[PDB]
């Protein structure tokens, strides 16, 4: 609240300093921001405690940055950490005390939890509460009465208005409890699903699963893990532990196929007990319990084919022990979020690898599913070797003079097609691909503009893939990339970042970017995180190049796009010039070729 002569807020008169400040490695700002030391001997204990009570926002190598909020404190209470149980240790760890503001915030957030519980039974959602005064003073606003369908006091609530009531309670200061007591539940018989000994659970996976199962009752929340870290395995383990009917929701055909494959590989459950509620193919969804389907189908708003209507009615009628949702970052979308209310589930677990978006709808996930239970430390995984180390780099390509002339002259938005296609970046990508090809490194080129992708691919006679590409040709190209030594590069379009199971690649060049999309950046980066059989963290075998054009809007987009990665800790090294480019022969070495490319770009319209 107090501002120094500079921008930083003043806290000299706010909180004191502990005498043994050197011993205490923890800081506590009044706003809730906490700065932990990664060099302290008790760093591991401090990390565990701060991860338990707070969500990371920036975890560089030296000083980690966390911030706590109501959702994080509710998650702490869910895993069973009381207000004293957290605040006493927070004061002990803190080297400068705990401000009264944070003290009262923690007390209020902890006490305002568990008073209101939401439990669905016999397809009816009852708002139970041991304390009756909570309901007595909660029925002040008319929205509760209109929403409601027309000790231990409970009342039934309308299915459709659950989301509205939950978001209302969040700001009403009485969070709802979504814990599932699968251990004590006889209404829905347990499913015959077990985890085979073959599956191996990594320490971070086990920690995330523990945070989810803080107690005997499973907690509904979101666990963010890298795509290469085995989030599919974590979800399968969660379903197996729940031992009740599980509905996994993918985002595409590839996602559902991969989910079925993961289920069969890691769970002893028989093949016949798994169904694919997919329009392309179905396996008698009503027949078995464990189901894999898609948001588009479940939230489909237009006409429903009679068979799918029967399946949808069956799904609505039945109650699901677990609702796994992969790629939760798309949930807050209108149709996708409608699925949450369409289907009934005790706990709706969420898994993803890029929980970031521009529109401020990510906060809605906290109530749509639950608090962010776990968020894996990418740097720690890199050190442990579970994830391939990546030498993140941004190659600056100076824009050609004529191209810059037209780009600046035109105030329209042909610049997206223009600066994405310039001779300098073309030569840079050509030279980089040549260097990695002679180095036997697998290349996955990326480009949002299909026009630019096709032009580059024809000029380099490479197998570009994109949306309306035939599925058979897509599979053939991927198989050739994985097996044929003569080819070691594939030019994938935006479809690549959506969802795929692609072979591990040693480099990932991105000539063009869709825009300031942290989601796309992280999605494309996750491709090369696949750990090799015998690599090492320090070898930096994996490389990521984000080619950008100097003095162009692409620079702003790249800087706005690398925020999530830098927050994780990746250091994007800038490359102004590439050694050997002048000696190496490359296309567009003369003014004329740039002229024809510019003419084609202009005629593109």
């Amino acid at each position: 609240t107090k501002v120094d002569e500079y921008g930083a807020k003043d806290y000299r008169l706010q909180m004191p300093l502990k005498d043994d400040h050197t011993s205490r490695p923890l800081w506590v700002a009044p706003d809730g921001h906490i700065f932990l030391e990664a060099f302290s001997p008790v760093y591991k204990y401090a990390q565990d405690f701060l991860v338990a009570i707070a969500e990371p926002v920036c975890r560089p190598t030296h000083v980690h940055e966390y911030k706590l909020t109501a959702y994080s404190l509710y998650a702490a209470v869910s895993v069973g950490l009381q207000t004293s149980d957290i605040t006493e240790y927070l004061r002990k760890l803190s080297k400068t005390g705990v401000p009264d503001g944070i003290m009262q915030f923690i007390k209020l957030c902890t006490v305002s939890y568990g008073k209101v519980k939401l439990v669905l039974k016999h397809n009816r959602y009852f708002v139970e509460s041991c304390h009756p005064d909570v309901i007595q003073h909660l029925l002040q606003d008319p929205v509760i009465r209109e929403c409601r369908l027309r000790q231990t006091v409970s009342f039934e609530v309308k299915q459709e208005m659950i989301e509205e009531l939950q978001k209302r309670c969040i700001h009403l200061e009485y969070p709802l409890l979504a814990e599932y007591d699968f251990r004590n539940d006889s209404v829905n018989p347990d499913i015959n699903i077990d985890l085979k000994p073959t599956a191996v659970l990594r320490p971070y996976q086990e920690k995330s699963l523990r945070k989810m199962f803080g107690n005997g009752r499973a907690r509904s929340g979101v666990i963010v893990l890298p795509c290469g870290a085995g989030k599919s395995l974590v979800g399968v383990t969660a379903a197996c532990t729940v031992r009740k009917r599980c509905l996994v929701l993918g985002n595409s055909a590839v996602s559902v196929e991969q989910w079925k494959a993961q289920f069969k590989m890691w769970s002893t459950i028989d093949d016949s007990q798994i169904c694919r509620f997919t329009s392309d193919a179905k396996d008698k969804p009503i027949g078995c319990s464990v189901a894999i389907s898609t948001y588009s189908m479940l939230g489909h708003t237009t006409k429903r084919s009679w068979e799918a209507e029967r399946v949808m009615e069956w799904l609505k009628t039945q109650e699901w022990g677990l609702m796994i949702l992969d790629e939760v970052h798309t949930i807050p979308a209108k149709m996708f979020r409608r699925v949450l209310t369409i289907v009934q589930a005790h706990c709706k677990l969420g898994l993803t690898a890029t929980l970031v978006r521009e529109d401020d709808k990510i906060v809605d996930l906290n109530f749509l599913i639950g608090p962010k239970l776990y968020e894996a430390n990418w740097m720690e995984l890199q050190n442990n070797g579970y994830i391939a180390k990546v030498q993140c780099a941004e190659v600056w390509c100076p824009m050609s003079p004529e191209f810059y002339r037209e780009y600046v002259a035109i105030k329209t938005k042909k610049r997206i097609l223009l600066y994405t296609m310039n001779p300098n970046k073309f030569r840079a990508c050509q030279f980089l691909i040549k260097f990695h090809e002679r180095r036997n490194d697998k290349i996955i080129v990326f480009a949002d503009n299909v026009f630019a992708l096709k032009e580059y691919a024809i000029r380099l006679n490479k197998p570009y893939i994109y949306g309306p590409t035939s599925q058979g040709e897509r599979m053939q190209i991927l198989q050739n990339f994985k097996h044929n030594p003569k080819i070691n590069t594939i030019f994938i379009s935006k479809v690549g970042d959506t969802s795929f199971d692609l072979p591990e690649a040693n480099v990932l060049i991105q000539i063009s970017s869709h825009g300031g999309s942290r989601r796309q950046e992280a999605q494309r980066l996750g491709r090369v995180l696949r750990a090799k059989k015998g690599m090492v963290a320090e070898e930096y075998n994996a490389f990521f190049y984000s080619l950008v054009s100097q003095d162009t809007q692409e620079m702003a987009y790249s800087t706005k796009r690398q925020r999530f990665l830098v927050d994780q800790g990746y250091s994007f090294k800038v490359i102004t010039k590439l050694a050997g480019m002048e000696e190496e022969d490359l296309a567009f070495s003369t003014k004329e070729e740039q002229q024809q490319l510019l003419q084609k770009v202009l005629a593109a319209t």
Binding site: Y45, F49, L81, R210, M212, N215, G216
Partner: peptide, 18 residues
């Protein structure tokens, strides 16, 4: 037959005392 996760949180910091 329950799993280790159902037991409870590890509470890794509880070991340290001052």
């Amino acid at each position: 037959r329950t799993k280790r996760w159902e037991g409870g949180y590890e509470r890794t910091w509880e070991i340290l005392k001052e």
